[PDB]
Design a protein around this ligand. Structure first.
Ligand code: ZN
Length: 257
């Protein structure tokens, strides 16, 4: 019964998921004055030309745009990574107000939202196997600010009415996730965790510095989603973000000078 409400939010998760207080939890604050350029990092390789989106699902915590991950169709390689990571889904975290919503922060700045493109290491065969490994996942995080519209997001926005409530899904084929990327692939990277239960410490985080812009109308439509199921009391799906966690014995590395 974890969530983001008044009595089951992030500060409670440790009772059922004790790793919530672990050594490698996410998100974190990215201090641009202490993150160090690492000349051994490589350019990110994002290969999404062959991506097969399938479906969009309201899971009661966010919505996931799901991809066919049964071949190397949409892969992330390079950067900090060894090997090949397959795109399985993307989702967002967002706020009730434009001044909040992101999970990572940059010098304590919260963005209006944050996109997570989740990929699993093909060395481990299936997602469920991958999340049990310290290098099982690579998550590409992208900040959203409110300004201009993002044209490549509109098809997502326009399907949200069909998945208003928890447990609803809709066909969602032929969506191109390249339309959600900023111009630059400059990034920060560090080792961390899933930001939702089970909070497993299986992620290489790759957080892009350049945000994307979405319009106020686009974010307003996200804020019309519901955490609840159909026929239940309406609880708007807003503020579905975990706050920054202690960095502990980690370093954040920058791909750029
Ligand atoms: Zn996420």
């Amino acid at each position: 019964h974890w969530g983001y409400g008044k009595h089951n939010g992030p500060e409670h998760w440790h009772k059922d998921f004790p790793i919530a207080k672990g050594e490698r939890q996410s998100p974190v604050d990215i201090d641009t004055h202490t993150a160090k350029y690492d000349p051994s990092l490589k350019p990110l390789s994002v290969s999404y030309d062959q991506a097969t989106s399938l479906r969009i699902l309201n899971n009661g915590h966010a919505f996931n745009v799901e991809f066919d991950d049964s071949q190397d169709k949409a892969v992330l390689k390079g950067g900090p990574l060894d090997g090949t990571y397959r795109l399985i889904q993307f989702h967002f975290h967002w706020g009730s107000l434009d001044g909040q919503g992101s999970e990572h922060t940059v010098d304590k700045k919260k963005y209006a939202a944050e996109l997570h493109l989740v990929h699993w290491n093909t060395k481990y065969g299936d997602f469920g196997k991958a999340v049990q490994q310290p290098d099982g996942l690579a998550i590409l995080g992208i900040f959203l600010k409110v300004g201009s519209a993002k044209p490549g997001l509109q098809k997502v926005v326009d399907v949200l009415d069909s998945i208003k409530t928890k447990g609803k899904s809709a066909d969602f084929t032929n969506f191109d996730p390249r339309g959600l990327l900023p111009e630059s692939l400059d990034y920060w990277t560090y080792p961390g965790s899933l930001t939702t239960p089970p909070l497993l410490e299986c992620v290489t985080w790759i957080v892009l510095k350049e945000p994307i812009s979405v319009s106020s109308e686009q974010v307003l439509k996200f804020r019309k989603l519901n955490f609840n199921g159909e026929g239940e009391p309406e609880e708007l799906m807003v503020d579905n973000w975990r706050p920054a966690q202690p960095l502990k014995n980690r370093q954040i590395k920058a791909s750029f000078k």
